[PDB]
């Protein structure tokens, strides 16, 4: 059998070009080379408070968007997290092998706490442990994620090693698969802050389901720098906005940084923003054209969730049975 | 019938104070209420312990509760890990529980020890629980469960019952043998307590060593302030035999504390004979214990699945196919 790939995304907010290039692009390319399992993590999404109707719609939006990117249901397992009970079951067990200090020092908890001061809930604090359960359930070898999830992934490795040291080879120790380009896609009007899928200022974001014409106007108004003459060169410290635009172009087209610098030799930020606007608009037009065809076909979406949760439960139950045997519970019969 | 929920830890060796107190109280109320006993193996793992002893202790606790008089036909009795819904609801309730609330409960500690009160709330709220018997140490945990229930209900309508504490205490007093001011608790000093599995010889040894007083002449009379040791032995004997305190004072008229101790040891062992006989018979019947665990999990999961479905429908999750 092939090595196993696992990853997930929250059905909350509107998934961006950041979410695509950091995770979903890699998900589609790994499907033949590895046995891939992709999850709509609705149990994680509710750590930030959601409208009930908006959550349900977002789950089905996210599933249709996976399919629009090229996530084949005949190649990969595609499921909703809450449909497999073993994620919560293993999650509780892994709380008992996760330290308090590890969770409190997490960057995602600190930033999300400051952002949602009125709802610093226990789920938001306990986010990483359920994520470790999501990965460890399927004997996962590779985990394709963006730069922001590096810390959470290191904990999953530490938990897997900590549990295996006491009980034997029950889990596989997962490894990160973070890409070279597009691992940390930044905000258009604030290049130092990463692109959010629920930004209060919409002008920071390039949404995947967003109107192409609106996205072109956003790329044109992206902040750059005061350099005289203007020069298209990758430099995150000095030229954060220009570098973010180069990073976005490189990932859509496939061309490298020095290739693009040579292409924009003797050119200025008009040529740069024109190429990003054209490249990104053609991507989103093609993607949204496939999306609605998937999203309005409810019988098809229902079948994908049905088959995916069924495939996932087989893997999940086997791992949880071994966990429960090792920690010393009386086996269910 | 109101629904009652009790979490039974698979770790401690139950005492006669546990038995004659709350447990014997509840054995006779199994037709009055819908009693649910959950052996909480998922709570146990918050403290790191040997795996094989945990599996043993779960079956020990199951057999002992069954031996004490819990009826699988009348009451639902099950292992916590056999019902996935506990873990499922517990994660949901994490998202509607403040971080501040858990930190306000009175680095190197594991996240389970920090977060078990939310699981403890899910344990109760899954079964539409009306009454929850608790000690002083678990009063804060019940209060959180009620706050979570009201918080969730206020957003999404009446999904959960707001549970109440079961107020009335047992009536049987059982204090520690070498410290009669202190209540007998399943204690580091094991000569303070009488376990339910102890043979007659061990009961004679512990009751003999139990403190009394230096009254001259020695007089068997009830007095908690002055004669704490002698009073505890009378309450133990009264709890076993059902005789009143004034009757026993007349029964031990002109009698020394050696006579009292002899009767207390005989009486307690007489109670523990029928109890231990039932324990060892149930504990070593593997098919019987497996059938009780299957039926109880099946009864529990029917209740639990209905509540979780209403919770999941209210939160807005896409329903399982
Ligand atoms: N500005 C950005 N630039 C580049 N990449 C980004 C940007 N923002 C987000 N990402 C990546 O997109 C994925 C989805 O993020 P979510 O917030 O939906 O969701 C998350 O951040 C995960 N915790 C969901 C999850 C739950 N369980 C798991 C198990 C394995 C892997 C992932 C998961 C992520 O891979 C994230 O790294
Ligand atoms: C890490 O996932 C978790 C799963 C379950 C719980 C409960 C039962 O409170 C908490 C956390």
Swiss-Prot record, chain A:
It is found in: Cytoplasm. ATP binds at residues 10-12, 18-19, 146-148, 185, 194-198. It catalyses: tRNA(Trp) + L-tryptophan + ATP = L-tryptophyl-tRNA(Trp) + AMP + diphosphate + H(+). A motif ('KMSKS' region) lies at residues 194-198. SUPFAM superfamilies: Nucleotidylyl transferase. Changing residue 195 to I: In TRPS271C; activity largely reduced. Transmembrane segments: none annotated. GO terms for molecular function: ATP binding; tryptophan-tRNA ligase activity. GO terms for cellular component: cytosol. L-tryptophan binds at residue 134. Its EC number is 6.1.1.2. Catalyzes the attachment of tryptophan to tRNA(Trp). Amino acylates tRNA(Trp) with both L- and D-tryptophan, although D-tryptophan is a poor substrate. NCBIfam families: trpS (TIGR00233). PANTHER family: TRYPTOPHAN--TRNA LIGASE, MITOCHONDRIAL. This is Tryptophan--tRNA ligase. It comes from Escherichia coli (strain K12).
UniProtKB/Swiss-Prot annotation, chain B:
It catalyses: tRNA(Trp) + L-tryptophan + ATP = L-tryptophyl-tRNA(Trp) + AMP + diphosphate + H(+). GO terms for molecular function: ATP binding; tryptophan-tRNA ligase activity. The gene is trpS. PANTHER family: TRYPTOPHAN--TRNA LIGASE, MITOCHONDRIAL (PTHR43766:SF1). It comes from Escherichia coli (strain K12). Homodimer. GO terms for cellular component: cytosol. This is Tryptophan--tRNA ligase. Its main location: cytoplasm. Changing residue 58 to R: In TRPS567C; reduced activity, thermolabile. GO terms for biological process: tryptophanyl-tRNA aminoacylation. The keyword Lipid metabolism does not apply. A motif ('KMSKS' region) lies at residues 183-186. ATP binds at residues 9-11, 17-18, 135-137, 174, 183-186. Belongs to the class-I aminoacyl-tRNA synthetase family. A motif ('HIGH' region) lies at residues 10-18. It holds the Pfam family tRNA-synt_1b. Gene3D superfamilies: HUPs, Tyrosyl-Transfer RNA Synthetase.
């Amino acid at each position: 059998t092939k090595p196993i790939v696992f990853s997930g995304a929250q059905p909350s907010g509107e998934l961006t070009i950041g979410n695509y290039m950091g995770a979903l692009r890699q998900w589609v390319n790994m499907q033949d080379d590895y046995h891939c399992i992709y999850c709509i993590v609705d149990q994680h999404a509710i750590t930030v408070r959601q409208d009930a109707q908006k959550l349900r719609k977002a789950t089905l939006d996210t599933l249709a968007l996976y399919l629009a990117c090229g996530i084949d249901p005949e190649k990969s397992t595609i499921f909703v997290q809450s449909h497999v009970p073993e994620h919560a079951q293993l999650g509780w067990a892994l709380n008992c092998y996760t330290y308090f200090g590890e969770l409190s020092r997490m960057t995602q908890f600190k930033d999300k706490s400051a952002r949602y001061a009125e709802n610093i809930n226990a789920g938001l604090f306990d986010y990483p442990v359920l994520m470790a359960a999501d990965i460890l359930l399927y004997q996962t070898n590779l985990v394709p994620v963006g730069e922001d999830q590096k810390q959470h992934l290191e904990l999953s490795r530490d938990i897997a090693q900590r549990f295996n040291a006491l009980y034997g080879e029950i889990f596989k120790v997962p490894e990160p698969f973070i890409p070279k380009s597009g691992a940390r896609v930044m905000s258009l009007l604030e290049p130092t802050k990463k692109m959010s899928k629920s930004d209060d200022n919409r002008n920071n974001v390039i949404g995947l389901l967003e109107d192409p014409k609106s996205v072109v106007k956003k790329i044109k108004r992206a902040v750059t720098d005061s350099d005289e003459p203007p020069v298209v060169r990758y430099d995150v410290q000095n030229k954060a906005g220009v570098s973010n635009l180069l990073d976005i172009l490189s990932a859509v087209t496939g061309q490298s940084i020095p290739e693009l610098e040579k292409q924009f030799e003797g050119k200025m930020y008009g040529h740069l923003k024109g190429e990003v606007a054209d490249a990104v608009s053609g991507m989103l037009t093609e993607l949204q054209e496939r999306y609605h065809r998937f999203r309005n076909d409810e019988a098809f979406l229902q079948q994908v969730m049905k088959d995916g949760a069924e495939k996932a439960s087989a893997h999940a139950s086997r791992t949880l049975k071994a966990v429960y045997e090792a920690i010393g519970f009386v086996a269910k019969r």
